[PDB]
Amino acid sequence: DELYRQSLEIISRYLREQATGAKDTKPMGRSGATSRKALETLRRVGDGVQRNHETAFQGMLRKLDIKNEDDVKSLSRVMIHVFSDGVTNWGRIVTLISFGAFVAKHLKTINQESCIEPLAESITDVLVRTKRDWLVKQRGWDGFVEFFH
Amino acid sequence: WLLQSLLRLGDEINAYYAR
Ligand SMILES: [Zn+2]
Ligand SMILES: [Zn+2]
């Protein structure tokens, strides 16, 4: 599963670097160049989504009220609820990833940094499991970079 | 109806870049 590996690599690095400010220097791996451009597209579009919709996102975060490990469960089920809908497009996908980064920042502030990687895997698992066909047809993360050129 | 607010926001963002 190369799509899953690449998706996790992109989403995990974005969430961690958004939460800590630290960039991960380790090599990518297979299809490394496309992942680096996806991540650059993600910083550009995703940082913007977070800035331009901080009020809405914070109200959403407030609803989830995340103060402990068990609260962290609710986050994946929101992901499942969306991706279980039949509609698929890159705007939904980048928006859910961006909300993941917003919640990752929170988790760091609440001394739950160890929860960020599981959060990233849950996002990746749901995205790839539920939308594999659609993603494949866009040429995976190459379509993402080209859609947001 | 949080779910529906996120979907709605994502569809907005999709429309903007599809133009
Ligand atoms: Zn916007
Ligand atoms: Zn945890």
Resolution (A): 1.9
Q: How far apart are CA A14 and CA A17, in angstroms?
A: 5
Q: What is the 3-state secondary structure (H, E, C) of A121-137?
A: HHHHHHHHHHHHHHHHH
* Residues in contact with A86: Cβ distance below 8 Å, sequence separation at least 6, in sequence order: none
From the list B5, B17, B18, the residue facing A56 with the nearest CB is B5
At the top level of CATH, the class of A1-148 is: mainly alpha
Check if the beta carbon of residue A11 is closer than 8 Å to that of residue A104.
no
C-alpha angle with apex A31: A27 to A37, nearest 5 degrees?
Answer: 80
Residue to mutate among B13, B16, B17, B19, with most A CBs inside 10 A, is B13
d(CA A21, CA A46): 15
Element (H, E) at A116: helix A116-137
Which B-chain residues 1-19 have CB contacts (< 8 A) with chain A? 2-3, 5-7, 9-18
Token pair belonging to A89: 């497009």
A49 burial level (CB within 10 Å; 0-12, 13-18, 19+):
buried
**How remote is the CA of residue A138 from the centroid of ligand 2, in Å?**
33
**Chain B positions in Cβ-Cβ contact with residue A91 (cut-off 8 Å):** 10-17
* Dist CA B10 CA B14 (whole Å): 6
Contact B11 A92 (CB under 8 A): yes
Distance CA A117, CA A8 (A): 10
Token pair, residue A143, equals 């379509």
Do residues A123 and A80 make contact, with C-beta atoms less than 8 angstroms apart? no
Tell me the two tokens of residue A94: 């980048």
Angle between helices A116-137 and A90-109 (to 10 degrees): 170
Which amino acid, one-letter code, is at A140?
A: G
Number of neighbours of residue A7 by Cβ within 10 angstroms: 25
CB contacts of B9 in chain A (<8 Å) are 53, 56, 95
Q: What residues contact A74, with CB distance under 8 A and at least 6 apart? A: A64, A66
Length of chain B: 19
> What distance in Å separates the CA atoms of residue A92 and residue A124, rounded to the nearest whole number?
14
Longest dimension (CA), chain B: 28
Residues present in chain A in total: 149
Alpha-carbon distance B18 to A97, whole Å?
19
Count Cβ atoms below 10 Å from residue A86 Cβ, excluding itself: 6
Residue A87 Cα, ligand 2 centroid: separation in angstroms? 30
H-helix or E-strand containing A75?
A: helix A69-83
